[PDB]
Amino acid sequence: MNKEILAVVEAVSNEKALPREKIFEALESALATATKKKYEQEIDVRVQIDRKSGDFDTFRRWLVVDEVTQPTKEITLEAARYEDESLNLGDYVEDQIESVTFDRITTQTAKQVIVQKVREAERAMVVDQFREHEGEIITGVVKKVNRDNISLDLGNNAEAVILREDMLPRENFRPGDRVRGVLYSVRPEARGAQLFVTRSKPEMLIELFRIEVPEIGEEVIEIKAAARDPGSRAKIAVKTNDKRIDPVGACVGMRGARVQAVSTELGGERIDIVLWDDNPAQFVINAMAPADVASIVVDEDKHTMDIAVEAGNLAQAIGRNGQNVRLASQLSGWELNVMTVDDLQAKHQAEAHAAIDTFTKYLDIDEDFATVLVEEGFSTLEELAYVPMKELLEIEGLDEPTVEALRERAKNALATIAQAQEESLGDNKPADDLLNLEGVDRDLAFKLAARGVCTLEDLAEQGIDDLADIEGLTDEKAGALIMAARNICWFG
Amino acid sequence: TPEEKLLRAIFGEKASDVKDSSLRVPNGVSGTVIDVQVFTRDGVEKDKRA
Amino acid sequence: QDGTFDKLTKKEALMRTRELEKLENSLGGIKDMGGLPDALFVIDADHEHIAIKEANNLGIPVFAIVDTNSDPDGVDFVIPGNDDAIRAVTLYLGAVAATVREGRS
Amino acid sequence: ELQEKLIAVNRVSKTVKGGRIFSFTALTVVGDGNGRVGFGYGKAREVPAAIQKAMEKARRNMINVALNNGTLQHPVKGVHTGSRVFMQPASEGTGIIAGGAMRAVLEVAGVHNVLAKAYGSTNPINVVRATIDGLENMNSPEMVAAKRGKSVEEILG
RNA sequence: AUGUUUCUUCUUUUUUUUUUUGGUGAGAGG
RNA sequence: GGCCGGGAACUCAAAGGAGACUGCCAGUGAUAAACUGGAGGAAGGUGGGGAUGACGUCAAGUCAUCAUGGCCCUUACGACC
RNA sequence: AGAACCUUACCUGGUCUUGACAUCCACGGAAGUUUUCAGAGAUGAGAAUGUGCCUUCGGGAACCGUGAGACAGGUGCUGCAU
């Protein structure tokens, strides 16, 4: 009876590595809840368990509050202090109440609350101790297969979920199968699965390489980037600081044994391993493997790269359904345009001709002088308007007066183009039609017209997604303006 | 069980996994209690309603 | 910082703090380093000659302040300068800290 | 990858008051077959560990030779301490023969056309130091067009 | 101061589970 | 005649532990290590003692504790008094 | 960690050789039990009589004989064969 409470507290404390105090607080709350259910009226109840005897006293608790909203569970501070002057706001006033007999009903409630406390203590501390597993490749047994998810049993009453998007496209699991996956998210939700496991995301590839390649686990080789088409093909970029180690050779292993182990775990996914370079152009050449790159042109302003390949290598460089270029672009972070050497030359000739036509038209220069500007690397009116005067003065045949005149013409051309844009929509079209939409300021009307939204009809045809990049336009404000435009155009 | 050692502690006055049943009576009929008789074998303490 | 005494005798744990502290100052704050760095700065090559030997076998570019008495057989970046000063080495250390201020962004 | 090739095994001892314990000096060579050559020095208390400990230095001792068309460049002297071997040219002679316990070394560089003759004392240990050292100061015609003359094409004719 | 003779050896290939609340008497409804 | 009561103080009897670590003090010594005095204690520097015999040498002895490859007896070298 | 027999493996003499001991093959004796002897004892030469349980009740395990045996036996050697 008495000594049995101590023996239970000691057994549970030792088996679940849990503070005895946390178990008692929870038993007190469990007994209070079981007591509340025996009364027909909603009462407040405090239970106190004696930590030496295991005896327990039950009260009619009266939450000391400033303003009483529930007279059955709350008491004013003035009324509480009439009984005990030591009471403060948030304390409980008690009332001698018959403690509920510990029947198998209270016993079952106590068991449930202990189990719940262990989930928030023993299991929580187990998840904290397994900080590596929360991120590394956990192993689970398939408990249940649904249409949209797979429930994994990790042991110790821990359940994980693999979502349909988190699976490989050709995997078929059965109840009882063992599955590995990366724990990519832990959610403290009051209902549902708390542990989310992925096999499709790039982290699964990185952690499989960490386990299979000791040199990655020892931080001698670093994985800098990973791009993945799950169950089909992946690319990984590897770097090392040790010049004695080949990072690609280490990840491949003897006759490809290491990369084949990772590929086999991923259902036969093809893995390309590329050397990371700090030069973006050299890194993209490496990422394009196995296609040979003939030349690269880098557009830093658009964050794009034009990749020329031999006509025989074009199909290999693009890959099946563009898979090779897409994985290289995701691995580099650059937009990659793959073309033939002949197509790249034709593109550059068309761009040079368009720049010459633009400069001849807007700068009132001859075609010979426009050609010199393009050969010196000027392609836009903005470059000519804003570039440091020293770079324009390095061009053979430009003097300080001619550079000043060229810059003034470029600025006047940009101002005339901007004004012709403002007149095409913003002085007539977006100053009456698009402006009518309640909320459109003149600045927003010109920002809309710069995207080709010149009329109130053009705005009524937009999605929120088409306007999301306009500086100062929130999704809510975009949605309100589109709805105002639709109300006038379609319902006026 | 651990819980059952706490079931033996505080209100173990409730035996073990107790379910103390009164004369919890069955169903099928309504009514209105019109008359109550209490007969006491002599020697037994009469309660307050007797 | 929380236990380390209630698991064995008190006599043992001062040997542990002897083991802790003398491996604290000598392993430094370098426990969270990447293990094999990309460069190593040498102030003087007289008795730290084992480093410039060892830093050369893995192809790692490593620097050197030289004085009159040491040899360039092994170092890469021979920079002159006296190795016996208090503020001047920090003036050298304030100079590289200007570069390391760019060596984070 | 590393294309292993292993050769050497012979006992060495220590002769302590307990006795003489047979350590095992064992040598090998590691290389791609297309330019990267470099070996490691290994010994243990048995045979299979010594060929495994010699591997790690050979990973960090690979030295390139600018393999021109899978052969040499020009006759170079592999003189070292104990062996004075020549590296005689044979431009696609289609014969892969070199010294004893040098032949298995010059399979891992890849070549198919060269002559040799280990001048001096027939030792397997000075070979693997010299047969890289002979290969080291060897340079392809481009590098010795990159320095001499200061006209690359004129030595090329 | 003296202390035979013929006598020592050395490392890289072997290894399946697993278990087939009854009786009697009376009355009544169809 | 602790023999007959009585007693749980006490020797003895037997268990789980408490008790010692250069912990403290001063001189000296490279702020270290450390020797050894001062203190109390049942004991002072691994308190007295035992058990545990490293890698290995004598290719030290034993086939007669037992095991066990060859060898020979197997109407005997085996068996009985 | 104890040499009168024993221990005892050594010696003298007298003895059986499928044997002190083991398992199996055919069949017999049941097993058991006291005592008179040639004899140093061994061994071998004999007389009185007995017979529990299962019974697939055309007989079997626990014990010995006589005959073939495979073997059994080895304190006989090699410690530098382990």
GROMACS .gro file of C-alpha atoms in nm, chain D residues 6-113:
model
  108
  653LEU     CA    1   5.276  -0.591  -5.598
  654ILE     CA    2   5.621  -0.750  -5.607
  655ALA     CA    3   5.849  -0.767  -5.307
  656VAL     CA    4   5.872  -0.999  -5.007
  657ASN     CA    5   6.173  -1.071  -4.782
  658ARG     CA    6   6.229  -1.105  -4.407
  659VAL     CA    7   6.415  -0.858  -4.192
  660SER     CA    8   6.473  -0.907  -3.820
  661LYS     CA    9   6.564  -0.720  -3.503
  662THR     CA   10   6.757  -0.971  -3.282
  663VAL     CA   11   6.651  -0.872  -2.930
  664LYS     CA   12   6.736  -1.070  -2.614
  665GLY     CA   13   6.403  -1.243  -2.663
  666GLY     CA   14   6.508  -1.339  -3.015
  667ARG     CA   15   6.486  -1.223  -3.377
  668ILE     CA   16   6.139  -1.122  -3.497
  669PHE     CA   17   6.081  -1.149  -3.872
  670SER     CA   18   5.945  -0.820  -3.996
  671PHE     CA   19   5.846  -0.824  -4.363
  672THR     CA   20   5.967  -0.548  -4.594
  673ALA     CA   21   5.727  -0.553  -4.891
  674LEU     CA   22   5.719  -0.316  -5.187
  675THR     CA   23   5.476  -0.235  -5.467
  676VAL     CA   24   5.377   0.042  -5.706
  677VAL     CA   25   5.056   0.234  -5.780
  678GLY     CA   26   4.959   0.428  -6.091
  679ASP     CA   27   4.694   0.508  -6.351
  680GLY     CA   28   4.862   0.377  -6.665
  681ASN     CA   29   4.836   0.715  -6.834
  682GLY     CA   30   5.083   0.943  -6.657
  683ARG     CA   31   5.051   0.935  -6.278
  684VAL     CA   32   5.319   0.716  -6.116
  685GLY     CA   33   5.422   0.691  -5.750
  686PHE     CA   34   5.494   0.422  -5.490
  687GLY     CA   35   5.494   0.359  -5.115
  688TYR     CA   36   5.737   0.199  -4.868
  689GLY     CA   37   5.576  -0.069  -4.650
  690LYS     CA   38   5.666  -0.321  -4.379
  691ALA     CA   39   5.483  -0.502  -4.099
  692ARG     CA   40   5.507  -0.815  -3.886
  693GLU     CA   41   5.343  -1.025  -4.164
  694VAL     CA   42   5.282  -1.017  -4.539
  695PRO     CA   43   4.920  -0.889  -4.596
  696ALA     CA   44   4.939  -0.579  -4.375
  697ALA     CA   45   5.264  -0.456  -4.531
  698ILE     CA   46   5.113  -0.443  -4.879
  699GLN     CA   47   4.823  -0.248  -4.727
  700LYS     CA   48   5.029   0.005  -4.530
  701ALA     CA   49   5.240   0.076  -4.839
  702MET     CA   50   4.922   0.182  -5.018
  703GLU     CA   51   4.862   0.510  -4.833
  704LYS     CA   52   5.197   0.666  -4.920
  705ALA     CA   53   5.150   0.563  -5.282
  706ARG     CA   54   4.825   0.760  -5.282
  707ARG     CA   55   5.024   1.068  -5.187
  708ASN     CA   56   5.341   0.991  -5.388
  709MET     CA   57   5.196   0.989  -5.742
  710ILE     CA   58   5.421   1.205  -5.962
  711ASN     CA   59   5.326   1.286  -6.321
  712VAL     CA   60   5.562   1.231  -6.617
  713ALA     CA   61   5.370   1.400  -6.908
  714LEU     CA   62   5.330   1.061  -7.087
  715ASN     CA   63   5.388   1.147  -7.455
  716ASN     CA   64   5.195   0.891  -7.668
  717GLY     CA   65   5.226   0.633  -7.391
  718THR     CA   66   5.608   0.635  -7.389
  719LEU     CA   67   5.909   0.840  -7.279
  720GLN     CA   68   6.058   1.153  -7.426
  721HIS     CA   69   6.433   1.105  -7.466
  722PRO     CA   70   6.722   0.899  -7.315
  723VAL     CA   71   6.760   0.992  -6.950
  724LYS     CA   72   6.991   0.867  -6.674
  725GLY     CA   73   6.828   0.686  -6.384
  726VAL     CA   74   7.147   0.684  -6.180
  727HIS     CA   75   7.081   0.649  -5.808
  728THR     CA   76   7.246   0.480  -5.510
  729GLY     CA   77   7.308   0.126  -5.624
  730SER     CA   78   7.175   0.120  -5.980
  731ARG     CA   79   7.269   0.334  -6.279
  732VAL     CA   80   6.991   0.240  -6.522
  733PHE     CA   81   6.949   0.406  -6.859
  734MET     CA   82   6.610   0.490  -7.008
  735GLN     CA   83   6.673   0.413  -7.374
  736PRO     CA   84   6.422   0.544  -7.629
  737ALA     CA   85   6.229   0.318  -7.860
  738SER     CA   86   5.961   0.512  -8.049
  739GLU     CA   87   5.681   0.255  -8.087
  740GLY     CA   88   5.917  -0.037  -8.087
  741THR     CA   89   5.616  -0.232  -7.953
  742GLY     CA   90   5.821  -0.405  -7.689
  743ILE     CA   91   5.759  -0.379  -7.315
  744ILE     CA   92   6.080  -0.500  -7.153
  745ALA     CA   93   6.275  -0.338  -6.869
  746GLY     CA   94   6.478  -0.461  -6.575
  747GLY     CA   95   6.388  -0.745  -6.346
  748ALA     CA   96   6.155  -0.606  -6.075
  749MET     CA   97   6.128  -0.294  -6.289
  750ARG     CA   98   5.903  -0.450  -6.552
  751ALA     CA   99   5.613  -0.482  -6.309
  752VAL     CA  100   5.674  -0.119  -6.214
  753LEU     CA  101   5.660  -0.003  -6.576
  754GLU     CA  102   5.329  -0.175  -6.639
  755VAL     CA  103   5.161   0.079  -6.414
  756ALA     CA  104   5.284   0.378  -6.612
  757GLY     CA  105   5.123   0.221  -6.920
  758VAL     CA  106   5.395   0.223  -7.185
  759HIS     CA  107   5.456  -0.027  -7.464
  760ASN     CA  108   5.787   0.086  -7.621
   0.00000   0.00000   0.00000
